[PDB]
Design an enzyme around this catalytic site. Structure first.
Site, PDB file in Angstrom:
ATOM      1  N   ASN A 132       0.875  -1.166   0.000  1.00 37.43           N
ATOM      2  CA  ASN A 132       0.000   0.000   0.000  1.00 37.43           C
ATOM      3  C   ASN A 132       0.912   1.215   0.000  1.00 37.43           C
ATOM      4  O   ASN A 132       2.103   1.111   0.323  1.00 37.43           O
ATOM      5  CB  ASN A 132      -0.905   0.026   1.230  1.00 37.43           C
ATOM      6  CG  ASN A 132      -0.129   0.147   2.515  1.00 37.43           C
ATOM      7  OD1 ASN A 132       0.514  -0.805   2.950  1.00 37.43           O
ATOM      8  ND2 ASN A 132      -0.174   1.326   3.130  1.00 37.43           N
ATOM      9  N   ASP A 147       1.686  -8.922   1.242  1.00 36.03           N
ATOM     10  CA  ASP A 147       2.537  -7.847   1.760  1.00 36.03           C
ATOM     11  C   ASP A 147       2.954  -8.206   3.192  1.00 36.03           C
ATOM     12  O   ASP A 147       4.127  -8.094   3.558  1.00 36.03           O
ATOM     13  CB  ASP A 147       1.780  -6.500   1.715  1.00 36.03           C
ATOM     14  CG  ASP A 147       2.620  -5.313   2.216  1.00 36.03           C
ATOM     15  OD1 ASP A 147       3.852  -5.307   2.044  1.00 36.03           O
ATOM     16  OD2 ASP A 147       2.035  -4.357   2.770  1.00 36.03           O
ATOM     17  N   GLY A 182      -2.247  -9.805   3.758  1.00 40.07           N
ATOM     18  CA  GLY A 182      -2.063 -10.541   2.522  1.00 40.07           C
ATOM     19  C   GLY A 182      -0.602 -10.855   2.261  1.00 40.07           C
ATOM     20  O   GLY A 182       0.186 -11.013   3.194  1.00 40.07           O
ATOM     21  N   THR A 201      -5.440  -8.089  -7.178  1.00 39.49           N
ATOM     22  CA  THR A 201      -6.499  -9.102  -7.132  1.00 39.49           C
ATOM     23  C   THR A 201      -6.813  -9.519  -5.694  1.00 39.49           C
ATOM     24  O   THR A 201      -7.691 -10.345  -5.451  1.00 39.49           O
ATOM     25  CB  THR A 201      -6.148 -10.379  -7.940  1.00 39.49           C
ATOM     26  OG1 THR A 201      -5.070 -11.070  -7.308  1.00 39.49           O
ATOM     27  CG2 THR A 201      -5.762 -10.030  -9.368  1.00 39.49           C
ATOM     28  N   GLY A 202      -6.091  -8.950  -4.740  1.00 37.39           N
ATOM     29  CA  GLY A 202      -6.345  -9.274  -3.351  1.00 37.39           C
ATOM     30  C   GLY A 202      -7.523  -8.473  -2.825  1.00 37.39           C
ATOM     31  O   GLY A 202      -8.644  -8.597  -3.322  1.00 37.39           O
ATOM     32  N   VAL A 203      -7.266  -7.635  -1.829  1.00 39.27           N
ATOM     33  CA  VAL A 203      -8.312  -6.820  -1.235  1.00 39.27           C
ATOM     34  C   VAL A 203      -8.722  -5.655  -2.146  1.00 39.27           C
ATOM     35  O   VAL A 203      -9.779  -5.056  -1.951  1.00 39.27           O
ATOM     36  CB  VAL A 203      -7.857  -6.283   0.147  1.00 39.27           C
ATOM     37  CG1 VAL A 203      -6.871  -5.141  -0.027  1.00 39.27           C
ATOM     38  CG2 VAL A 203      -9.057  -5.854   0.960  1.00 39.27           C
ATOM     39  N   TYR A 204      -7.895  -5.336  -3.143  1.00 43.78           N
ATOM     40  CA  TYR A 204      -8.214  -4.249  -4.072  1.00 43.78           C
ATOM     41  C   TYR A 204      -9.322  -4.599  -5.062  1.00 43.78           C
ATOM     42  O   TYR A 204      -9.819  -3.732  -5.784  1.00 43.78           O
ATOM     43  CB  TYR A 204      -6.961  -3.799  -4.824  1.00 43.78           C
ATOM     44  CG  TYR A 204      -6.077  -2.900  -3.993  1.00 43.78           C
ATOM     45  CD1 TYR A 204      -4.870  -2.416  -4.496  1.00 43.78           C
ATOM     46  CD2 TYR A 204      -6.448  -2.535  -2.697  1.00 43.78           C
ATOM     47  CE1 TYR A 204      -4.054  -1.593  -3.731  1.00 43.78           C
ATOM     48  CE2 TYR A 204      -5.641  -1.716  -1.919  1.00 43.78           C
ATOM     49  CZ  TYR A 204      -4.440  -1.248  -2.446  1.00 43.78           C
ATOM     50  OH  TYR A 204      -3.629  -0.449  -1.679  1.00 43.78           O
TER      51      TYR A 204
END
Length: 172
Positions: free
Chosen positions: A23, A33, A31, A121-124
């Protein structure tokens, strides 16, 4: 022969550079990160603090390179993918920038191999099918004109993404 799809933990793949979908704060989060920061150790965050001090937050599409700490890599490239808001807010180009800017840093620092996570494709919430097409297309066009990196690895945690990627790579 220069592009490979691998299902697993990106933090365990021995490559020159591991790309972190982070981020803008660069202070780490959840995730992949989060998994990257833990594996790399506290040295990663310390390097990110230095970057913030010199350039502030990392804007969407931007990339910055730092050391890799305890990771099985020589460096970590932190990039920020777009948050999906429908497609009418340049998200497609921003995702492309994250991949391209990341590749440029890899080449600029003379690295030979890089591993990419499924950015955004994760939380975004970026639509998986469309995200993969952009990543595959972007990387493919880049290595076609650049000798470095020599090898690119798409490391997918989700089986869904792995299947999409392998299908796209053979669909060319």
């Amino acid at each position: 022969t220069r592009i490979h799809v691998v299902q697993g933990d990106i933090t365990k793949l021995a490559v020159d550079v591991i790309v972190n979908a982070a981020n803008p704060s660069l202070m780490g989060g959840g995730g992949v990160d989060g998994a990257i920061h833990r594996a790399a150790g506290p040295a990663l965050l310390d390097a990110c603090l230095k970057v913030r001090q010199q350039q502030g937050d990392c804007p969407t599409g931007h990339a910055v390179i730092t050391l890799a700490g305890d990771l099985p890599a020589k460096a970590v490239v932190h990039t920020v993918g777009p948050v999906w808001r429908g497609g009418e807010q340049n998200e497609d180009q921003l995702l492309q920038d994250a991949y391209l800017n990341s590749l440029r840093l890899v080449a600029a620092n003379s690295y030979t191999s890089v591993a990419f996570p499924a950015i955004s494709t994760g939380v975004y919430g970026y639509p998986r099918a469309a995200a993969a097409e952009i990543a595959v297309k972007t990387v493919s066009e880049f290595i076609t004109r650049h000798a470095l990196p020599e090898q690119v690895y798409f490391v997918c945690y989700d089986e869904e993404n792995a299947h999409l990627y392998e299908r796209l790579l053979t669909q060319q």
